[PDB]
């Protein structure tokens, strides 16, 4: 992709004890415009792996059909071996690096959470192929407006709970609503646990208070 | 599929190429054609195969197929297999004049086709061309030349040679009546008609069963002119009347 | 009579002679034995003597850290297929950063081995392989044959006079899972011993033993390293 | 593209197309050459002169380079492809190396080319054998012989074509340091060998001598008769 | 993948058997008789359907290449079609380069070259169809005959198909160089009458002419007018 | 020598290389399937040669997609390739058209892949017969069978293996149109054991699978609880 | 009679009489299916009728059919190897579709058969591939010419028909229906469905039931090809 | 009748089966692997006295530390020794190390059994190699002597004899060879067996020998150096 068209905004993430949770608002962006607000940028890959992405939404649908379909192909023969959250993160990092080598990159900026083998996995995949594993992740402007709040809580308390990390995500998402023009009120929260990935419905930031 | 392949490019137990040796016998039944190297020019005397009365004239000639302004050929073999050869010869000769801005030497154009005719006798598994065609022309170095190119891919220079039907009996006559360096143009036209008589089963020559083309130098320009019916009939009447005076 | 010259020509009995002649070459080879327990999978093979002064062979090649094979068949066709197996295992760790499941590696062999069988002008792979590997599902003995089909075995022996070894394996096949690492190899040794003439015995120089496991990667044992295993035989 | 194996193995380890390619060598004209001290000589035996031939283009002695030339026996067509492509290698080697080609270099290129078409798909081996002479940068004479199978060997004297078995036995007993000493006696050694394989009589042959200084100049039919008259 | 080895090879007698047997399919085909008159050329062929259910207005054995060129065949139906559609392509490739109506002799050499290519390149059999090609160029009539080997011959009048030997001798007697287009049509119909075995009608043959106005095939109404004489 | 190539017709207009290809299916153990109102039920008689083979080896039931199953009878080599090709046929469909492939379209794409190799001498026809089945809300259950010639017909039930006619007599009187999937699973095992020969082939392993509404359009191998119930019910009627 | 020499018995080339010894066996391969198709066109309509035989009770009647829809206004019926049948139909649907995308309008029946006849011709000229063992019958309504019924064969012969017969009974059904070439159009109108039914029922002496055959038609008022339901076929079968 | 890829009723792959028989028409080549070095001895088989013996190379330079002996058709092994020299330089180029003898013989043997007339490549080998190469040299593991069969099967050999006289020559190697012998005894023991298997008179002209020491590089003996060993035999 030489230039993006419909772009997404910051996608958060944090790992807690028992799973990983991320959140992303539902809005489309073309030339400083909110166009499609019904688009869901959080994808459920398979039972043990969950994914979310900022950036171009059109390139994300290509990653929906290419990556999601590989899950079926692995489940056709059914020998008991499934893709781990760090294996999909590795295959996806390889696919993102192969695109920039031909100078046809994908503008997507992605965050991959997952829970497997009793260990919560969280990973980052960018357009340029930069990949790593951090306890908390925020893309786009979330690195400026959110990750400082993420590292602040995780520095004093490295291990969180499911309810405490949820308040951490909802509080950082509300901060994204104030100072980011590409943000949006309604947002999806998906959580992977020992029972699998569960994508909750729309949640509103309307509890915010503006004092002028 | 190996079962359906006829193994054309293989070797015989005696060291022979089947499709090459069988293509030579197709030439032995092909149209009789000969040529004579003289001092001021070279000619091509070819016996016309189809004498049928309902046949018309199309362009300029029958078996000739002039390859260039400075040289021409004559073909004996499969009538179709000669056409693709003459087209490639006109391609090779003009690529030389395009590349080197010079008229093609007769020694070079013969070498080029004999490499293409050989290409099908070695690799590709195709059949070789069943046509052995002669060469006449003029260059800036050795002047007038006469060549014979066999389907095997080999060629050579000839002062007098014949191809087609009754070629063995025609070369034997050219070994005696021909004199090296002493043959002029008009003496060669009479020698060509003399060979076309004994080498053809017909009682005589009516001039519609033969075609003769001469190549001479006029004012520093090579001209190729096929003798018309009235010009060939004068040669036949000259040899038919002189034969009665020799007996 | 005329149906045996091509692999793409079916016989009147609905049979392909060319593929079966390739399965004759693996039975004219050297006897190779392998079996798995609930923990480790072991490959034990006879290294054939072409002469008295020659170091016999190496019939066990390294594919990946968690995967290993045993060669019965044409040797040059084995590494030609093994180089694809080595490239396939490196493909997973390169792209997926995970060990490739042994069941999926053998499925890629059946797809590649079949292509020469169905096309004219090509021959089936004339080498069988006993593949030992440790995946998340445990040890894997998965077998490959000149025919593209593969089989999942608890214990298997191929090569010359391998039927006498399969008779030994089928009798004791119930106790294989309860065997420890040291006693597990001894079953493959006695199974491979039945593949030898009465005038031949198992030495240290002619025997190579591959082993793959959970906490132990795939390693080959040379003539000096197979002495502790032959101490009880 | 036509891909098929023309040359395949046979019982008792034989190659039919390769062995039958050597049969065409024994069916061609006889070419004989020797290696002297400062001089090398090549010659061929023409089957029938007939006095209809143009003797220039029918020459079986070609020149691969200024210091390298060759004479063959076999199908005339299979030769011309070898001479033409070897002259390209002699010019391409002068491009990169900036030195004249060594006699063994072009011999290995021709031997490998005769080898390549034996094991290549849909390609027949050459039906010719080549006798290559030349002089290296130090001035040492060289005589090599290539076969349709692709093997090359150096020779003090060699004979190819029909009747080569009788000429090789003739050159074996008559080759010594005395006959290879004088430059004129070396030329007569080939002619004496050619007259044994020619059943017609006189000189129908064609012979070419390549020295060091002023390379090769082929001998005319009148100049070859002077040596035949001296050996009579 | 296709066969790269030539199916047509030289027989031990020095002949090409696949082309020689290709002439047998031409000799067993439907008779077609071309005649080259002074102001034009006529092509008359025998179009006979095995039953009355076949549609005579569906396919035309006489088909034009360009407006000024058309040709008819004696031989197999299908092997003519891929041959004649390429002749229509080779004719317009000339018109693209030279922006000029293609000469007849130039069109025959390109079609005969394609008929030769399948007698040499491997994996393909020769054509079993022979051509009678007409055209009007440079104020002169043209009549040619393309052999399955790829050889062409200029004919004033000729015939092929069933009983071509007895038919060809019938033309040489009644043919004249001073004949016009109207007189050459009747002589071409009389040759189709030489071997028929039945009662011929307007739908029992197909006839077409090439004059200075271009090439066109005669409608079944115009064919009946020429059958009354 | 008319039978030495698939591109050569016989004097009577038959291609033996295609006809000898389906004869290898007759040398393979019986595999059947039944299309009922609630879905499609599959079954296979899987003959294990040596007891050394692990249970589940040489799996005869392949899933070319999540809602489509596959059951093969013939050479096991040609069975796994056609399974992967049928996977690619369903793979390229969901990529381009974005929705699940109808089994009417899936069976037609694979049947032409099999027939494409019957027209040339450079390749050989497949020697295995395989069946397809699926379930959908709008399309319902569908069962097709592709022969080695590349032909695909619709079937309520089909029998391919050693005994073709023996199992068809049991399926025709079954009256599957009014029966649900759970009732067919017990009937399929009864048909596998009655066509089996206790003389020639001794050791065998029953392979069963279904697809239908109770899986919400999904094809999976039978759990051990249901499989044990159908095998015990089938042996009771065998006597 | 016909001489045979060389490879004529395997790859398609010239017989000593030039009969294409191998190509003639693709016509006999059509009779291997043991079926007969009868196609006839009227003034305003064209009708195709073929035999529908279910060998086993486990077959699905809706899935087994020899009538296929190439385009909206063009129908089809096949007689020959059913495996070769589906291959030629998919090529006809792909060829007719390239017409609309390239040339802008719906393809006539005239040139839909010739291109397929040219494709089947490629199988006859090349030795590496065998001709198709089936014949295609294509019908439709042309703008200028109206109803058209053509059939292409393994040899590539698409020449027109006033009525078309195929299969084992082709020889018997052609001569019987040839006597119906008598009166102009043989009472050509919507009931020409019975014209094809009585011709097919006469040669086989079957006296088909409503579901025993399958029928489809194209008309001027309804240019779209429709496959007649067994309930509609029973209306025409009960009238004869 | 049949193609280059076919399996025998015993699975012998006739093309290589007939290629091994072509080795039995070649000259005898003998070599010995000692602890102090390896040696390679081969018969030249002079056809005529006019043949220059200096132009017959049946022993060529693969790398500086590696050398190879050849047998059978001299031509067919010329393309294998050329790919070996390129393989040794490709390894020293990338890894900056002397290429081991194990990888040299394994890489060259990969060209064996790889051939076909169907879609192999733009260029292809119509037949396998009818030659047998004896590879030798000193690597990091010490002096090594290997063999390469037309079937692509390479075997580590202490002493092996190939060529027409290979039968009966290997029986002479097993008697006189032992692990403690030196290189000087290996050169002498080679010519003694050569004296038995050579038809003509054995002298410095018709014999070709070269050795590889661990300290030194590959070197071939001259005309004066061969005269000393012959007088000792």
mmCIF file of C-alpha atoms in Angstrom, chain D residues 24-220:
data_model
loop_
_atom_site.group_PDB
_atom_site.id
_atom_site.type_symbol
_atom_site.label_atom_id
_atom_site.label_comp_id
_atom_site.label_asym_id
_atom_site.label_seq_id
_atom_site.Cartn_x
_atom_site.Cartn_y
_atom_site.Cartn_z
ATOM 1 C CA UNK D 24 30.382 -42.391 -38.925
ATOM 2 C CA UNK D 25 33.967 -41.341 -38.169
ATOM 3 C CA UNK D 26 35.314 -44.504 -39.814
ATOM 4 C CA UNK D 27 32.948 -43.857 -42.751
ATOM 5 C CA UNK D 28 34.479 -40.465 -43.579
ATOM 6 C CA UNK D 29 37.643 -39.341 -45.315
ATOM 7 C CA UNK D 30 41.021 -40.196 -43.803
ATOM 8 C CA UNK D 31 42.739 -37.369 -41.916
ATOM 9 C CA UNK D 32 46.294 -37.894 -40.654
ATOM 10 C CA UNK D 33 48.612 -35.566 -38.756
ATOM 11 C CA UNK D 34 51.849 -35.651 -36.755
ATOM 12 C CA UNK D 35 53.699 -33.516 -34.212
ATOM 13 C CA UNK D 36 57.295 -32.592 -35.011
ATOM 14 C CA UNK D 37 59.768 -30.372 -33.216
ATOM 15 C CA UNK D 38 59.080 -26.797 -34.385
ATOM 16 C CA UNK D 39 56.528 -27.941 -36.961
ATOM 17 C CA UNK D 40 53.109 -29.616 -36.993
ATOM 18 C CA UNK D 41 51.410 -31.010 -40.107
ATOM 19 C CA UNK D 42 47.771 -31.817 -40.899
ATOM 20 C CA UNK D 43 46.373 -33.558 -43.957
ATOM 21 C CA UNK D 44 43.259 -35.213 -45.379
ATOM 22 C CA UNK D 45 42.558 -37.702 -48.170
ATOM 23 C CA UNK D 46 39.865 -36.641 -50.634
ATOM 24 C CA UNK D 47 37.741 -39.539 -51.868
ATOM 25 C CA UNK D 48 37.137 -38.311 -55.434
ATOM 26 C CA UNK D 49 38.440 -35.085 -56.967
ATOM 27 C CA UNK D 50 36.458 -35.382 -60.254
ATOM 28 C CA UNK D 51 37.742 -31.887 -61.245
ATOM 29 C CA UNK D 52 34.254 -30.462 -60.709
ATOM 30 C CA UNK D 53 35.093 -29.354 -57.155
ATOM 31 C CA UNK D 54 35.936 -25.893 -55.881
ATOM 32 C CA UNK D 55 38.859 -26.844 -53.660
ATOM 33 C CA UNK D 56 38.587 -23.846 -51.313
ATOM 34 C CA UNK D 57 35.347 -24.535 -49.394
ATOM 35 C CA UNK D 58 35.611 -28.349 -49.411
ATOM 36 C CA UNK D 59 38.774 -28.171 -47.306
ATOM 37 C CA UNK D 60 38.562 -30.389 -44.222
ATOM 38 C CA UNK D 61 41.390 -28.437 -42.542
ATOM 39 C CA UNK D 62 39.929 -25.381 -40.819
ATOM 40 C CA UNK D 63 41.579 -22.755 -38.591
ATOM 41 C CA UNK D 64 40.151 -22.222 -35.111
ATOM 42 C CA UNK D 65 42.629 -19.413 -34.378
ATOM 43 C CA UNK D 66 45.936 -18.015 -35.628
ATOM 44 C CA UNK D 67 47.888 -20.512 -33.495
ATOM 45 C CA UNK D 68 45.182 -23.226 -33.418
ATOM 46 C CA UNK D 69 43.735 -25.233 -36.312
ATOM 47 C CA UNK D 70 41.946 -28.562 -36.686
ATOM 48 C CA UNK D 71 41.204 -31.275 -39.239
ATOM 49 C CA UNK D 72 38.292 -33.676 -38.848
ATOM 50 C CA UNK D 73 36.873 -36.916 -40.199
ATOM 51 C CA UNK D 74 33.168 -37.683 -40.313
ATOM 52 C CA UNK D 75 29.891 -36.115 -41.407
ATOM 53 C CA UNK D 76 30.834 -32.778 -42.967
ATOM 54 C CA UNK D 77 27.813 -31.047 -41.414
ATOM 55 C CA UNK D 78 28.587 -32.110 -37.831
ATOM 56 C CA UNK D 79 32.079 -30.639 -38.226
ATOM 57 C CA UNK D 80 31.117 -27.110 -39.317
ATOM 58 C CA UNK D 81 29.120 -26.611 -36.106
ATOM 59 C CA UNK D 82 32.207 -27.555 -34.081
ATOM 60 C CA UNK D 83 34.630 -25.303 -35.980
ATOM 61 C CA UNK D 84 32.273 -22.306 -35.923
ATOM 62 C CA UNK D 85 31.470 -22.569 -32.206
ATOM 63 C CA UNK D 86 35.107 -23.230 -31.267
ATOM 64 C CA UNK D 87 36.205 -20.088 -33.124
ATOM 65 C CA UNK D 88 33.735 -18.180 -30.940
ATOM 66 C CA UNK D 89 35.352 -19.610 -27.803
ATOM 67 C CA UNK D 90 38.821 -18.718 -29.112
ATOM 68 C CA UNK D 91 37.685 -15.098 -29.525
ATOM 69 C CA UNK D 92 35.809 -14.987 -26.208
ATOM 70 C CA UNK D 93 38.884 -16.342 -24.407
ATOM 71 C CA UNK D 94 41.025 -13.562 -25.890
ATOM 72 C CA UNK D 95 38.458 -11.089 -24.535
ATOM 73 C CA UNK D 96 38.756 -12.005 -20.841
ATOM 74 C CA UNK D 97 42.254 -13.528 -20.629
ATOM 75 C CA UNK D 98 43.993 -11.148 -23.110
ATOM 76 C CA UNK D 99 46.179 -14.069 -24.195
ATOM 77 C CA UNK D 100 46.051 -16.530 -27.108
ATOM 78 C CA UNK D 101 44.194 -19.755 -26.450
ATOM 79 C CA UNK D 102 46.224 -22.741 -25.335
ATOM 80 C CA UNK D 103 45.856 -25.846 -27.469
ATOM 81 C CA UNK D 104 44.560 -27.906 -24.528
ATOM 82 C CA UNK D 105 41.951 -25.261 -23.639
ATOM 83 C CA UNK D 106 40.097 -25.371 -26.961
ATOM 84 C CA UNK D 107 40.507 -29.160 -26.970
ATOM 85 C CA UNK D 108 38.693 -29.431 -23.631
ATOM 86 C CA UNK D 109 35.983 -27.044 -24.850
ATOM 87 C CA UNK D 110 35.381 -29.176 -27.947
ATOM 88 C CA UNK D 111 35.595 -32.408 -25.941
ATOM 89 C CA UNK D 112 33.101 -31.057 -23.397
ATOM 90 C CA UNK D 113 30.852 -29.932 -26.262
ATOM 91 C CA UNK D 114 30.980 -33.401 -27.821
ATOM 92 C CA UNK D 115 30.262 -34.713 -24.320
ATOM 93 C CA UNK D 116 27.345 -32.355 -23.651
ATOM 94 C CA UNK D 117 25.238 -33.581 -26.589
ATOM 95 C CA UNK D 118 25.759 -37.202 -25.505
ATOM 96 C CA UNK D 119 24.046 -36.689 -22.129
ATOM 97 C CA UNK D 120 21.674 -33.880 -23.232
ATOM 98 C CA UNK D 121 17.990 -34.477 -23.939
ATOM 99 C CA UNK D 122 16.859 -34.717 -27.549
ATOM 100 C CA UNK D 123 20.369 -34.173 -28.924
ATOM 101 C CA UNK D 124 22.570 -36.607 -30.831
ATOM 102 C CA UNK D 125 26.345 -36.834 -30.367
ATOM 103 C CA UNK D 126 28.697 -35.629 -33.067
ATOM 104 C CA UNK D 127 29.672 -38.126 -35.747
ATOM 105 C CA UNK D 128 33.133 -36.606 -36.149
ATOM 106 C CA UNK D 129 36.608 -36.873 -34.657
ATOM 107 C CA UNK D 130 38.960 -33.897 -34.506
ATOM 108 C CA UNK D 131 42.744 -33.655 -34.820
ATOM 109 C CA UNK D 132 43.922 -30.358 -33.306
ATOM 110 C CA UNK D 133 47.457 -28.972 -33.581
ATOM 111 C CA UNK D 134 48.952 -25.771 -32.261
ATOM 112 C CA UNK D 135 51.710 -24.008 -30.368
ATOM 113 C CA UNK D 136 51.550 -22.665 -26.823
ATOM 114 C CA UNK D 137 52.980 -19.364 -25.600
ATOM 115 C CA UNK D 138 56.329 -21.065 -24.946
ATOM 116 C CA UNK D 139 56.438 -22.542 -28.461
ATOM 117 C CA UNK D 140 55.878 -26.215 -27.652
ATOM 118 C CA UNK D 141 53.979 -28.167 -30.334
ATOM 119 C CA UNK D 142 50.720 -29.897 -29.454
ATOM 120 C CA UNK D 143 48.667 -32.641 -31.102
ATOM 121 C CA UNK D 144 45.299 -33.679 -29.667
ATOM 122 C CA UNK D 145 42.487 -36.018 -30.702
ATOM 123 C CA UNK D 146 38.850 -35.855 -29.601
ATOM 124 C CA UNK D 147 36.191 -38.559 -29.846
ATOM 125 C CA UNK D 148 32.380 -38.449 -30.106
ATOM 126 C CA UNK D 149 32.241 -39.790 -26.537
ATOM 127 C CA UNK D 150 33.941 -36.607 -25.306
ATOM 128 C CA UNK D 151 37.400 -37.984 -24.473
ATOM 129 C CA UNK D 152 40.531 -36.095 -25.525
ATOM 130 C CA UNK D 153 44.139 -37.288 -25.624
ATOM 131 C CA UNK D 154 47.462 -35.897 -26.802
ATOM 132 C CA UNK D 155 49.366 -37.727 -29.526
ATOM 133 C CA UNK D 156 52.771 -37.788 -31.150
ATOM 134 C CA UNK D 157 51.016 -39.038 -34.295
ATOM 135 C CA UNK D 158 47.377 -39.867 -34.966
ATOM 136 C CA UNK D 159 45.047 -40.938 -37.766
ATOM 137 C CA UNK D 160 41.265 -40.651 -38.108
ATOM 138 C CA UNK D 161 38.712 -41.685 -40.703
ATOM 139 C CA UNK D 162 38.515 -44.810 -42.815
ATOM 140 C CA UNK D 163 41.562 -47.054 -42.748
ATOM 141 C CA UNK D 164 42.859 -45.308 -39.623
ATOM 142 C CA UNK D 165 43.667 -48.675 -38.025
ATOM 143 C CA UNK D 166 46.215 -49.394 -40.774
ATOM 144 C CA UNK D 167 47.662 -45.867 -40.768
ATOM 145 C CA UNK D 168 48.012 -45.795 -36.972
ATOM 146 C CA UNK D 169 50.048 -49.007 -37.157
ATOM 147 C CA UNK D 170 52.046 -47.401 -39.977
ATOM 148 C CA UNK D 171 52.749 -44.284 -37.907
ATOM 149 C CA UNK D 172 53.584 -46.350 -34.809
ATOM 150 C CA UNK D 173 56.656 -48.129 -36.240
ATOM 151 C CA UNK D 174 57.832 -45.278 -38.502
ATOM 152 C CA UNK D 175 57.748 -42.436 -35.935
ATOM 153 C CA UNK D 176 61.157 -41.567 -34.471
ATOM 154 C CA UNK D 177 63.391 -38.611 -33.645
ATOM 155 C CA UNK D 178 65.042 -38.721 -37.085
ATOM 156 C CA UNK D 179 61.857 -38.327 -39.151
ATOM 157 C CA UNK D 180 60.521 -35.587 -36.843
ATOM 158 C CA UNK D 181 63.809 -33.632 -36.979
ATOM 159 C CA UNK D 182 63.725 -31.903 -40.372
ATOM 160 C CA UNK D 183 60.707 -29.780 -41.249
ATOM 161 C CA UNK D 184 60.522 -31.245 -44.763
ATOM 162 C CA UNK D 185 60.837 -34.826 -43.496
ATOM 163 C CA UNK D 186 57.924 -34.217 -41.114
ATOM 164 C CA UNK D 187 55.687 -33.231 -44.038
ATOM 165 C CA UNK D 188 56.656 -36.398 -45.929
ATOM 166 C CA UNK D 189 55.701 -38.514 -42.898
ATOM 167 C CA UNK D 190 52.022 -37.604 -43.308
ATOM 168 C CA UNK D 191 52.043 -38.053 -47.094
ATOM 169 C CA UNK D 192 53.655 -41.491 -46.763
ATOM 170 C CA UNK D 193 50.846 -42.383 -44.345
ATOM 171 C CA UNK D 194 48.131 -40.942 -46.599
ATOM 172 C CA UNK D 195 49.312 -42.835 -49.695
ATOM 173 C CA UNK D 196 48.725 -46.118 -47.830
ATOM 174 C CA UNK D 197 45.025 -45.391 -47.219
ATOM 175 C CA UNK D 198 44.425 -43.952 -50.716
ATOM 176 C CA UNK D 199 43.640 -46.756 -53.174
ATOM 177 C CA UNK D 200 43.250 -44.428 -56.186
ATOM 178 C CA UNK D 201 46.888 -43.398 -56.647
ATOM 179 C CA UNK D 202 48.796 -40.168 -57.061
ATOM 180 C CA UNK D 203 47.909 -37.233 -54.847
ATOM 181 C CA UNK D 204 44.208 -36.520 -54.460
ATOM 182 C CA UNK D 205 44.974 -35.392 -50.914
ATOM 183 C CA UNK D 206 45.019 -31.972 -49.265
ATOM 184 C CA UNK D 207 47.674 -31.036 -46.721
ATOM 185 C CA UNK D 208 48.287 -27.946 -44.585
ATOM 186 C CA UNK D 209 51.334 -27.063 -42.476
ATOM 187 C CA UNK D 210 51.235 -24.649 -39.530
ATOM 188 C CA UNK D 211 54.548 -23.324 -38.226
ATOM 189 C CA UNK D 212 55.156 -20.724 -35.517
ATOM 190 C CA UNK D 213 56.449 -17.693 -37.395
ATOM 191 C CA UNK D 214 53.936 -16.717 -40.114
ATOM 192 C CA UNK D 215 51.449 -19.336 -38.770
ATOM 193 C CA UNK D 216 49.748 -21.560 -41.371
ATOM 194 C CA UNK D 217 49.663 -21.304 -45.147
ATOM 195 C CA UNK D 218 47.999 -24.275 -46.831
ATOM 196 C CA UNK D 219 50.025 -26.028 -49.522
ATOM 197 C CA UNK D 220 48.806 -25.870 -53.110
#
